[PDB]
């Protein structure tokens, strides 16, 4: 109300700050909204805030608009230089944050806001990492059931033909050492059969056409049946981590410790 | 009509709004039109809009056109009031998700005082953007077609040799049956035969190993590369076209980041047909 | 005398212009440089003008800022909220600008700037277009060299490989198909020759260790030597074509017709 | 010294520059340290330093504020052209970065010249603090390319003993068909079918080994070094975070490089990772 105000993270990039002001021609209390980048000096703050309040008298004579002053945590001053990602970082340790206008307070010298933190700021993020990872998982488990059918469907044609060429082992070794016909009554058998196998080995390739098709290849054909290609996969677990780490560096330089299985834990519950 | 406004999106970068309020003799109440960037500071708007009002005969001196002063919610998951330069475009977004904002003129004709303007949906902006998307993406799916056709002629063009090579082979295995079974001729004046064919393939089956000559990729081929081109249609294009509709989808997506509505290009997989 | 004034582009993103002015309390001419990016809006190039110009006093109230007012090409005002991209594009097409204070100080009250040209502009282009041209053409001519180089060596050895192989048809035809030894006293040649040509693939396999290395592999070994990667190739190629696409644009949207071998003339000459 | 200053580039965003001027709470002409950041007014700047001087007696008797400004050399590929007060510092300090050339005008104070000229930081100079967190992420990649290089050598030591097995039991299957075959003691026609019964049982291994190919988890990743160098060795994630934060400098580099007309080599700093 009086000397008090708040500052908010908006879902974009930016930030807001609230301050309790006096403008041109108001009263002495009214919420005035400013917008600002967190990369981006501190002088651009002081103008922004000293074109809404009226000017300091003379002075001898001055209309000079007034100086305010970013005391931070006792009464360390910070220079007009010092990055508000920097600055909203050291005062969310301090969780304090005063801004002494002059002139414009007659005596009261004093604004007190305060600093959103990491749990906070990042719920934020959270959410927006909470989604996208569920978004993660599901597809993750369609994905694997369709691993399965592919190996299972592959594995089985694969025992089959195995099946049959033993059959043809079986059948060699039975008919020339039965010694009923020769192995020169054998040649042509095996040769002409090496043969019929290239025929009956090269009729798949023109009319089912494969044109290598291989185990993974006929996983690689059926999810695109059962599921989302590749590209999109790897710009939610690459994006991902581009979340985490950002969580890492907010949540490291606010010094406390995180892991993200913590509302997994709420997921469900 | 008198206290309800409308800010659109138009195809450009530049938004309008329309809103009601006083002017010179000729009428009681028009809504408007002003053009605004999204660049502009506020001051400006309000100017914008103070400039096109008669004043208010004010005393003390004479400061005559008025002060107004924009109003919106600070959503709480009540009503601020926002400072007189902040950009246009950072307050549309953050008034955009809170679904309103209120402008305030100083004369207070109305007993109300108030003008609560509407506000531009995810619908109408990612309208603009869907039909630019669409309309690009249609645009390459039929060269997606062309590239298909063409890719059938090389199909055919493998499936002659491939026949001949079966007949051929047909040829062969007549051949040794008929000189092998008949027992004109012994088995062991065949088999020599068969040995020096089987050399035979294996050189022919070994040149080719040579014939990989070209292979320009990027999934792009060599044999049809002076085909589709040369004869057809560009990749130039198709590969500006690539370029120039990549990135329209990061935008829609930064958009729809802010507005918390999912977007899914196979919910409007659903509008290329009716 | 001084109602000139010229803009000039930044070999960066964003440009200058030079207007006449006066600023607190100077003599009546000065040039004075202001930056601008061509995305901004109209009003902000209005603003910084009206930042350093001294105040109009109109009674009962003094406008602290004037007013500006930048018509153009017969007289089109434009409003305030055009892109100055745009604004210079119809102005380059008028090869003109004009800005008018309301305020005049003595009998003075415009200013004629004068909008630059594709050709200058465009050389800010050129330069970096024509390094990048040279820099492709080397290298390409660099990697086809050595493109040519590999191929010589792989149809030696194949050639040599088809005259062994050819002499062991002729062998084994000449051996037993017309002389003493015949087809039952041949046979452990051929076979015993099988396996021995398949002792060589096993010493080759480890000794000097290929483990695919086909005709492509040794030509993608062999620049590796010879020359620099596709990454970067791919890039310069693909970044200059992305400036062939603006170049196209700005002429495009300035209506002079250019083709870029037109500075290759002037690369030897 | 007398007339000349440097704007030195600190290793964070912010600049710094120092300049002499007189000031009575120090004694004669003191350079002084003044920081600025790229996003700052030109206006502040001329605040700042209209700050740390004893002003100007107004010979009018009420307005002692000194009044500063700013003058570069306009290029025509002399002449000098001042400018405006509300600029951001960044795009003059590139724009006259390129011009090589500064200088100052302070009003009524200076004695004799009143010319300030300051000197900018060259583009090798810029650079500099670029490449040493470019040349560090480098060298720590490298190495971690090199402990791969040494699973590499792991993989090999297990192929080459697999196939050197393998050479052993064809070399027995030779000797073993050359000891039967020549000796007269069986001839050829009782060991051309065990030859074809053989091919038959190698085509039927070979038909095991080419259902082997199970995994596949490629990115250049392979699938039995997978496990190895993670879960006994050195990481991944961090190997593809170095990656990402390693090629964000390279462009920044590149574009700063454009702007002073000088050809960046990463092979000219090549010669630089070994003396
Ligand atoms: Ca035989």
């Given at each position: 109300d009086t000397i008090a105000g708040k500052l908010l993270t908006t879902p974009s990039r930016l930030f807001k700050l609230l301050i309790p002001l006096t403008t041109?021609?108001?009263?002495?209390i009214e919420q005035i909204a400013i917008l600002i980048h967190?990369?981006?000096?501190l002088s651009h703050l002081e103008r922004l805030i000293q074109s809404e309040v009226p000017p300091i008298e003379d002075e001898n004579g001055q209309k000079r608009p007034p100086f305010v002053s970013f005391i931070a945590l006792r009464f360390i001053r910070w220079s007009q230089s010092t990055e508000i990602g920097d600055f909203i970082r050291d005062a969310a340790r301090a969780k304090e944050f005063i801004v002494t206008i002059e002139?414009?307070?007659?005596?009261?010298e004093q604004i007190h806001v305060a600093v959103p933190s990491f749990d906070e700021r990042t719920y934020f993020l959270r959410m927006r990492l909470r989604k996208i990872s569920r978004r993660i998982q599901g597809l993750a488990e369609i994905k694997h059931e369709c691993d399965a059918l592919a190996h299972r469907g592959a594995q089985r044609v694969a025992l089959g033909g195995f099946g049959i060429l033993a059959f043809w082992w079986y059948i060699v070794y039975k008919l020339t050492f039965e010694t009923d016909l020769g192995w020169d009554t054998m040649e042509p058998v095996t040769y002409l059969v090496s043969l019929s196998t290239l025929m009956g080995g090269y009729l798949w390739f023109l009319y089912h056409n494969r044109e290598d098709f291989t185990i993974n290849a006929r996983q690689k054909k059926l999810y695109q049946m059962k599921g989302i290609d590749l590209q999109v996969w790897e710009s939610l677990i690459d994006e991902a981590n581009a979340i985490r780490r950002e969580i890492k560096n907010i949540a490291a330089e606010y010094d406390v410790d995180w892991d993200e299985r913590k509302d997994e834990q709420d997921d469900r519950v």
């Open positions: 041109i021609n108001r009263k002495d967190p990369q981006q000096p002139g414009a307070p007659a005596g009261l």
